[PDB]
Structure 1
């Protein structure tokens, strides 16, 4: 089947930010045209990559793609927020040992200082500036509801929490 790829990979963006959904599978059938499915409705884009420009609140929701095959792609979900700090994350469900990058991101390239990540309530790591937590070998205990506290323009802001859960790759 054609799986759906995200550039940048992050399914949680800010209002107004861009993202481009690309969708590809094994080339058993030659690539001619693609179908897009915002919420269930067919989008007016044929191209294999759809560029979601300037996010609005209505740009939220279930996304899906399709080719001339007999069967469809998975229901990737894209929530869109306007707020001060969004604790972005690579994937919402991962299997151990895949790369996981986390990023406590601030509105319009703004720089968040005194950044602290929380995993399930406890302080996982703190750094002076914003950082890219990166765990390449996710453990099954890594599953938690995460959130990050930061300081943007001298004021304190907590991101909305986001739960992530790992699974065992055998079975």
Structure 2
């Protein structure tokens, strides 16, 4: 019917090496096989099930994913990012529509516990929690755009995470608006030919003028 929708079912676009992530096509609770076409990094994969389960994410599992359920259209691409750090600020999304919602976290390496977590936005702290859990930001506005990072405590050592930028926009950018500039770019070429043809025609017409 309509387009397909691909959604990870951990809703985190940033994960660490060894994390488990499952990718879901149009959406149901079933691993229906021989019914889905999966494209990763512009190359069709051998997976044909409705669910693409990754038990241990690797650096090579990053990139772009597209699923196409049988009888439907191709889906909007989703990006997965796999990294290795000490502290990583997980986020549910990097671009949020108005009145949207997104979560953040502060996660450490390989099931290590973080304590005394402080969440910063543009170098200004807005929350603190002893444990590392969700920070749900509902009904997003333009005030919720900036650079995010967290500084927690490892086993006993303070560590700092890299800054992540989340932007709230009225509507998504469609990344292909320059394609409509081909038509104006072609008219100037055709119009330039017209001016060149005048000079040749006027010169030839002037040849008869001088003859007379």
Tell me the TM-score normalised to structure 2 length.
Answer: 0.72
The DSSP-based 3-state class of the residue aligned with 2:89 is strand
Cα distance in 2, alignment partners of residues 56 and 18 from structure 1: 10
Q: Deviations over 1:57-114 (max 9, x none)?
A: 1111111111234742122111101111111111111123333221111223322112
Deviation at 1:47, TM superposition (A): 0.9
- Structure 1 range deviating more: 12-21 or 124-133: 124-133
Report the counterpart of residue 164 of structure 1 in structure 2.
166
Report the counterpart of residue 95 of structure 1 in structure 2.
97
Say if 2:10 is the partner of 1:20.
no
Deviation at 1:45, TM superposition (A): 0.9
Contact 2:4–2:72 (CA under 8 A) maintained in structure 1:
no
The DSSP-based 3-state class of the residue aligned with 2:143 is helix
Between structures 1 and 2, the one with greater helix share:
2
Say if 2:112 is the partner of 1:114.
no
Tell me the TM-score normalised to structure 1 length.
Answer: 0.87
User: RCO (CA 8 Å, sep 6+): is it higher in 1 or 2?
Assistant: 1
Say if 2:13 is the partner of 1:8.
no
Say if 2:64 is the partner of 1:62.
yes
- The change in CA–CA distance for 1:70 and 1:102 in structure 2 (over 3 A counts) is closer
Report the counterpart of residue 146 of structure 2 in structure 1.
144
The DSSP-based 3-state class of the residue aligned with 2:110 is helix
Cα distance in 2, alignment partners of residues 70 and 127 from structure 1: 44
Bigger CA radius of gyration = 2
- Structure 1 range deviating more: 141-150 or 131-140: 131-140
Between structures 1 and 2, the one with greater strand share:
1
| Runs of 4 or more above 3 Å deviation | 68-71
> Unpaired segments of 5 or more residues in structure 1?
26-30
- The change in CA–CA distance for 1:89 and 1:128 in structure 2 (over 3 A counts) is same
